[PDB]
Structure 1
Amino acid sequence: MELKDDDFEKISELGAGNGGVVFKVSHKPSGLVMARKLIHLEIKPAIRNQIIRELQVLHECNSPYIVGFYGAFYSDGEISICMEHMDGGSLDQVLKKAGRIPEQILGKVSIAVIKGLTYLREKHKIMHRDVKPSNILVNSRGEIKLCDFGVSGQLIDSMAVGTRSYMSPERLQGTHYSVQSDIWSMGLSLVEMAVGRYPIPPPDAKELELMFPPMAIFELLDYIVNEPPPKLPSGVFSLEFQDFVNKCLIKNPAERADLKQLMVHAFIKRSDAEEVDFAGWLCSTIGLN
């Protein structure tokens, strides 16, 4: 079915960030509950047709680790991307309510992210460009999926920040970056969710006793590229998980691990075997089922 503006009704507000909000909505003709992202773009009528055309590849992006797609269209001033509604929300939201996320839970998350990035690269020959806690969605069925990836080249152009960067050192410095940049973003996201707050700058010795102002714009980005990367605090986290994020946060992208090597890492192998009721822990911390 072709999605259309007048066939929708606003239920509630799922959230917002650095632009247009996304609503919980009701596609009246199907009765299906969906999430509707609106991206306002002050753009000519020619290239906005190209954006919808390039967004049709999301129909062919079928995967359990990828957020579902129903269709895209231009209403009046803003393009629309309609997707599977994930009742658990994004991982930045569940980190707020949970304080920290257990290492065991982040194991299952890492499996979902690696398999999602792997699907996009092999089947669709594209990178994510925006891996962070807010673009990793979860639901009550226990599913962990990825949204907001770069399928349309024209949309990447039309939207080219925020005071929290998950961008790799190489992407920050210039145009010499590609799929490895996503690995850095994943590693930094995992350190954030494990520790309870954004990892840069790193906590001093005295701050780590409590758990177990904000930086200026240039101050933050200078730390990422020049100062040594964020490690995970020893003792409370296992050696396998410590080495996993260490491999993900190697400044040099060619020296840094890729999806191939991380898939066969000791941390992922152990996490696959583990009996983890992710659906139960998710509903316990946010309160749903």
Structure 2
Amino acid sequence: EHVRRDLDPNEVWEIVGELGDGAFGKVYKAKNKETGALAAAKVIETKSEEELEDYIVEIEILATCDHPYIVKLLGAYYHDGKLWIMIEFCPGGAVDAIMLELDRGLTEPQIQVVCRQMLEALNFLHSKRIIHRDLKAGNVLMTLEGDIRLADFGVSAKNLKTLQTPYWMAPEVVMCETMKDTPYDYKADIWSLGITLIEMAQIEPPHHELNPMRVLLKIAKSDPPTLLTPSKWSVEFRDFLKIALDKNPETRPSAAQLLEHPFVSSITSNKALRELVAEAKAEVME
């Protein structure tokens, strides 16, 4: 058990601030009493010991995934009726919040670094048989060194609900088993990645202008999205998008394959992102 049921968390940890109320809840800024290190925390009051299981599964995921580009789990406590989960503090904030502060999208050299780094994360995740299912610029966090961190496994953990003859089975039912089970569902993250790259270029994902209920339909019947003004962007970018955003997941490539694409195969430094994070920090000061 990575959740220490013993040991009250106010022995080691100490709260110092808030950060934001977005959808799921509040997020505190936390400090380590011994080492003095910063962490980002969630203190959850639990409606149900049944539901709790979802957050425990997230913790298990986080504890298994040691990779440079995925947030470190610094601690996990259940004490009183509350659940404490401490994450490596990422002081550059999320890329979407970055685009709000600078009031613009990322440049192509910036997107390349993010894309390259996400591919390495996904490729790691997919070889551990984990799917993110919730990739968007708001879940890509930045460190001051200009590296990303993938952050929220709240959807991915809910889907490891799967932890809990068919001669008469319908076609569309068959396909939603092989699609949702294995070799095929890795490709969903690949699609989302493609969409996160367009969000980064254009600030808003495709179909932002549509009401949420109608997007699902639009995604189903539409041609795959492309960049609004293809003048602005390199052929390598458009072609990367072209092949990542294949509606047919069978032919859509894996992360490991896309790491061999010219758009990211020559990315040796994270400088462009180091520069963007610095511009953001300075803008926050005003």
Class of the TM-score when normalised by the shorter of the 2 chains? 0.7 to 0.9
Count of residue pairs the alignment pairs up:
260
Matches within 5 A, 1:1-289: 4-7=8-11, 8-44=13-49, 48=52, 51-52=55-56, 55-98=59-102, 99-122=104-127, 124-149=128-153, 153=157, 157=161, 176-177=179-180, 178-200=185-207, 214-232=209-227, 233-270=229-266, 272-273=267-268, 276-287=271-282
- Corresponding residue for 2:167? none
In the TM superposition, what is the alpha-carbon distance from 1:133 to its structure 2 partner? 0.8
Give yes or no for contact 1:92–1:134 (8 Å, CA) kept in 2: yes
Q: Distance in 1 between matches of 2:117 and 2:273?
A: 12
In the TM superposition, what is the alpha-carbon distance from 1:266 to its structure 2 partner? 1.3
In the TM superposition, what is the alpha-carbon distance from 1:127 to its structure 2 partner? 1.3
Quick one: which amino acid aligns to residue 286 of structure 1? K
Q: CA RMSD in A?
A: 3.0
Per the alignment, in what secondary structure is the counterpart of residue 200 of structure 2?
A: helix
Give yes or no for contact 1:65–1:146 (8 Å, CA) kept in 2: yes
How far does the alpha carbon of each residue in 1:10-69 deviate from its partner, in whole angstroms, 9 at most, with x for none? 222222322112111112233221000244542226x73685377245334221111111
Give yes or no for contact 2:101–2:280 (8 Å, CA) kept in 1: yes
Q: Distance in 1 between matches of 2:58 and 2:110?
A: 35
User: Tell me, which stretches of 5 or more residues in structure 1 are unaligned?
Assistant: 158-169, 202-213
Give yes or no for contact 1:138–1:145 (8 Å, CA) kept in 2: yes
Per the alignment, in what secondary structure is the counterpart of residue 31 of structure 2?
A: strand
Cα distance change, pair 106–87 in 1 and its aligned pair in 2 (3 A)? same
State the 4+ residue runs in structure 1 displaced beyond 6 angstroms.
none
Q: Distance in 1 between matches of 2:147 and 2:280?
A: 16
Quick one: which amino acid aligns to residue 142 of structure 2? V
Q: Distance in 1 between matches of 2:80 and 2:270?
A: 48
Moved more, 92-101 or 12-21: 12-21
Give yes or no for contact 1:10–1:23 (8 Å, CA) kept in 2: yes
In the TM superposition, what is the alpha-carbon distance from 1:112 to its structure 2 partner? 0.9
Q: Distance in 1 between matches of 2:199 and 2:158?
A: 31
Per the alignment, in what secondary structure is the counterpart of residue 80 of structure 1?
A: strand
Q: Distance in 2 between matches of 1:62 and 1:134?
A: 21
Q: TM-score, normalised by structure 2?
A: 0.80
Q: TM-score, normalised by structure 1?
A: 0.79
In the TM superposition, what is the alpha-carbon distance from 1:241 to its structure 2 partner? 0.5
Give yes or no for contact 1:127–1:149 (8 Å, CA) kept in 2: no
In the TM superposition, what is the alpha-carbon distance from 1:259 to its structure 2 partner? 1.0
Cα distance change, pair 281–252 in 1 and its aligned pair in 2 (3 A)? same
In the TM superposition, what is the alpha-carbon distance from 1:77 to its structure 2 partner? 4.4
Q: Distance in 2 between matches of 1:61 and 1:77?
A: 27
Give yes or no for contact 1:51–1:155 (8 Å, CA) kept in 2: no
Quick one: which amino acid aligns to residue 256 of structure 2? K
Q: Distance in 2 between matches of 1:281 and 1:18?
A: 26
Quick one: which amino acid aligns to residue 88 of structure 2? E
Identity %: 31
Per the alignment, in what secondary structure is the counterpart of residue 14 of structure 2?
A: strand
How far does the alpha carbon of each residue in 1:65-121 deviate from its partner, in whole angstroms, 9 at most, with x for none? 111111222244443321100000011111112311001001000111010111122
Per the alignment, in what secondary structure is the counterpart of residue 271 of structure 2?
A: coil
Give yes or no for contact 1:86–1:138 (8 Å, CA) kept in 2: yes
Quick one: which amino acid aligns to residue 196 of structure 2? S
Give yes or no for contact 2:55–2:154 (8 Å, CA) kept in 1: no
Cα distance change, pair 76–182 in 1 and its aligned pair in 2 (3 A)? farther
